[PDB]
Design a protein around this ligand. Sequence first.
Ligand code: 4DW
Ligand code: PLP
Ligand code: PLP
Ligand code: CA
Lengths: 453, 454
Amino acid sequence: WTGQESLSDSDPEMWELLQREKDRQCRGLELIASENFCSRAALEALGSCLNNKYSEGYPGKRYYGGAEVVDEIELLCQRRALEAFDLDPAQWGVNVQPYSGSPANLAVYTALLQPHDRIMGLDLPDGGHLTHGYMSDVKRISATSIFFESMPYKLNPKTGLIDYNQLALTARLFRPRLIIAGTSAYARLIDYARMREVCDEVKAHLLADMAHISGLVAAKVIPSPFKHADIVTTTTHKTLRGARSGLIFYRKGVKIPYTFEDRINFAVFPSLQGGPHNHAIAAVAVALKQACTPMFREYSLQVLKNARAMADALLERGYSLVSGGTDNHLVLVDLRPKGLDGARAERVLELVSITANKNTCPGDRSAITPGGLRLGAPALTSRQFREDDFRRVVDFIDEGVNIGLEVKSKTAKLQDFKSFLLKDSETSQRLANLRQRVEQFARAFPMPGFDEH
Amino acid sequence: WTGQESLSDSDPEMWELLQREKDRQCRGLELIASENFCSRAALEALGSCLNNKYSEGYPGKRYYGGAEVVDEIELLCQRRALEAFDLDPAQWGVNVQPYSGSPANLAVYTALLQPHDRIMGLDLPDGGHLTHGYMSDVKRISATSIFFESMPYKLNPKTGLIDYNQLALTARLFRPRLIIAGTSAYARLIDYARMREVCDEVKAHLLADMAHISGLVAAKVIPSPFKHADIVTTTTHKTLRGARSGLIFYRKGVKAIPYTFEDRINFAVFPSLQGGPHNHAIAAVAVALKQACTPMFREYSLQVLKNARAMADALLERGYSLVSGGTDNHLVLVDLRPKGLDGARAERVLELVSITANKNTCPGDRSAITPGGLRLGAPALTSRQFREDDFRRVVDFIDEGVNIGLEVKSKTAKLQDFKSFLLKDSETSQRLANLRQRVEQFARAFPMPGFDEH
Ligand SMILES: Nc1nc(=O)c2c(CCc3ccc(C(=O)N[C@@H](/C=C/C(=O)O)C(=O)O)cc3)c[nH]c2[nH]1
Ligand SMILES: *Cc1c(COP(=O)(O)O)cnc(C)c1O
Ligand SMILES: *Cc1c(COP(=O)(O)O)cnc(C)c1O
Ligand SMILES: [Ca+2]
C-alpha cells in the first residue's frame, strides 16, 4: 500500500457511484438556482495535497510551523477575493476560511453580537435563508434562533417585494443589533440603500448575505451590496462557480475606526472552526481568478438574459411569475392559477430529469403545500445554454406541468399522485418518453469538470 | 470557456503553489501528530463532480430532488463508518455531514444541551481541545465557552495522567450535563470505564472525542471508547488518513424506553447548524473508511504504535525526559525543561531544518507563556513507510536540532533574540543549512501517498 493507487482500482464501488452521478448531471436539466458546475481547474486544487496541511491561525501568525506555501495561498485567495469584488484593501478585508456559507453567517453573529442579541432577516417562506433566523410557531430551527433572538421581516404579498416600510416600522420596535439583507428565493434586487437607512436609524449592523447573487455582483451586472453593507457573507459555490466554501468581507480603516477585522477573524478561529480546509481555499482562489475575467462577465450577462428568456417564455405560455418577472438569475413561478402546485410539479419534473424546487408563494402558509416553483439559469448557462435553449427548457417544463395536471384529475392525495406516476403504465410511459427527450437534449451540451467523475 | 481546462494551463500561479507544497511535504519530516497523508483514491473523490450537488437533509428525506446517487454515497459512508469501528447497526448510528472536527462537537452540544448548560473537558494546556471549552482568565475563547458553560478538568501534575479523582470530586460540585473524554496532547489511554462512572453518578452525558486516535481505535490496536461512551465524535483526517471532515456516532435503540440521540443529533447538524453537505468530502471519507477496515490498516496502526514506542525509547536513551514516562499511542510528549530547553526554541530550530513538530505545555512548566515541551507524532511518516530505525534516525536529527537549540540558548537572551540568532549568525546558519540538506535528502527517498505532482 502506497496510497498512490487510483480510485477505480482501489475502490470500484465508490468509482461506480462517482460515474453514475457524473452521468446524472450530464443528462439532466439542472434548474436549481443554487446549483452550478465547478471547473476542472478548481477541482484539481480541491482534491490535492493541500488537504494534508494543518494551518490553524492566519498567514504569518500560525500555531504550527511549515506554512510558508499555505500562507501564500491564503494571502493570494484574499487578494483575488478583493479583486473579484473590486474592493480597495485599505477599506475592506476578507476572511477565506469559513467552511461554507452557513458557518460564515454564524461566525459573523458570534463576532459582533452577544448571545441572545437581536437579528432580523427575511422570513424563510418569504425567500430568506435558515441562517438568517428561523423558528416555527412550534420550535427553534436554526441555531441562529437558538443562540440569538431573531424576528423575521416579510414580503408585501401584493407586489412580491420586500416590504421595506414594514421592516422600518417593526425594526424600531424590536431594535435589532444586526439586520440581514440577502435571499435564497427572490427574483428582484434588494434595496441595500433602504436597508442601510433602517440600520443607521436603529443603530444596527447591516449584513449583506449575497450567496445566491455573488457572481452577478463580481461581474458588475447588478448593483453591489458593498456600497452599503458593513459585512458581506457569501458562498464560493453557486454563481461564483467554485468549490463549497464561504467568505466574510468586512470594512476596515476609518468610519474613529472600524472594529470588525479582529472580531471576525477571532470568531472564525479560534472560536468556531479548527484547521482551515486549504484545499478548498485553493479551489476558491482558482474560481475567484476566473471571476475577474471578461469570460465571467459574459457568463453573468448570459445568466441574466437566460433568466429573462425563461421568464418571458413562461409568460407567453400563460404562467404567473411572483413579482411579475426577474432582475436576476432565477424566476419564481406561481402554479396556483394553472391548477397545480409546486410539490406535484417538482416530482413530475424530477422523473423527467429536470431538477427544480417547490417554493412557497406570498400569502400562503408554511404548512399549506407550496404553490410555486423556483427555476434558475446559472447551471445550464455554465453548460453554454443560450436564450433559445432556455425557451426549449420551458417547452419541456410545460409538458411536465400538463402531465402533472392530468395525474391530479385522476388522484386524490399527494401520496396518491406520487405512486401513480410510478405504477400507472400510461403515465409512466409518457414520462419515459419525455425523460429520454430531455436527456438527449441535455447530453449534447458541454459540462465543466472532469469527463468521467 | 468549457471549465475542462487543466489547472496547470489555466492558473499557472496556483499550480506552482500546489507543486511547492507537494515538494515541501515530500522533503520534510512531518512530526505533527495531527498530520497525515491522504490517499490518491480519496483525493480523486474529493476533487469530483460531487462538489456540484446540493443535498440538504438526509438520505430519503431531502428537500431537493435528483439526490438518488448522493443518497447511496451517504448511506455507504454511514455503513462503512459503522463497520470501521465494529458497531452493530441496531445499537449505533452515525452522521457523516459534519464539515470538520470542531463542527461535529458544536453540533453535539447544540443537539443535547440548552444554551449555557454545563460542560467539562480536559483543560487546553493539560492536553485538551479548544472545542472542549476554553476560556482564559481575560475572555471566552472557544464558542463552546460562549454558548455553553465550561469548567476544565486537569492532569495530576505528578503522574502526567488525567486526575480521575479530582474530576469526580469537582464534577459533583459543578454538575455538568456533558463531560468530554478526549485529547490533543496526551500520550496515554483514557479510562473510559472511569469517565462513564463519573458521568453515571452526576447524571451527565459522556462524549468521547477520539479525533486524535480514531485510526488506532478502528485498527483495534488500542481499546475502544464505544464500550463506555454514548456519543463519539471524530475527524476523518489525522489517524483515519481521510479527507478533512468529521463524524458523529451516537447510540440508538433500547436504553434500559429508547435512546433519543439520533433525531436531536441529526436535526442539530441540519437544519440548525449546517447548510448543504459537502458530498465530495463524504465520498472521500467513505474511501478512507474502506481503507481502515482492511488488514493493511491494522498493520499501519501497529507500526504507528511501534514507531512512537521507538521514538520514545530512543529519546529516553539520549537523556530526554518525557511527560507521563512513555506512550501507549501515536505520539510522545517531550519535556525539554529537564534538558534545559523548551518548546518554542526547539520548534523554530527543527522547522528551519524541515522538521515540523509542536510546542506543548507540560505539567512541570514554571513559566506559563513559553511552553517547556514538544509533541512528536508517528502517523504521518509511518504512512511514508517509516519503520523503527527510520524513527531512530529522525530522533538523531532532532537531537542535533535540540543541541543547536541548547548551544544557541547559552549564547542568547530572550525568545526573539533566539529566533534572530538562527537566521542571522553564519556559523549557526550553515550548521542548520547542513542539517537541513541531510534531513531533506533522507526524507525525499521515502514514498508519499497522493498524486505525484500536486
Ligand atoms: N429556499 C429554500 N427554502 C427552504 O425552505 C429550504 C430548505 C428547507 C428548510 C427547512 C428545514 C427544516 C424545517 C423544519 O421545520 N424541520 C422539521 C421539523 C421538525 C420538528 O418540528 O420536530 C421538518 O422538516 O418537519 C423547515 C424548513 C432547504 N433548502 C431550502 N431553500
Ligand atoms: C483536531 C481535533 C478537533 C478538530 O478538528 P478540525 O477539523 O480542526 O475542526 C477536535 N477534537 C479533537 C480531540 C482534535 O484533535
Ligand atoms: C446557500 C446559502 C447559504 C448557505 O450556504 P451553505 O454552503 O449551504 O451553508 C447561506 N445564505 C444564503 C443567502 C444562501 O443562498
Ligand atoms: Ca449594475
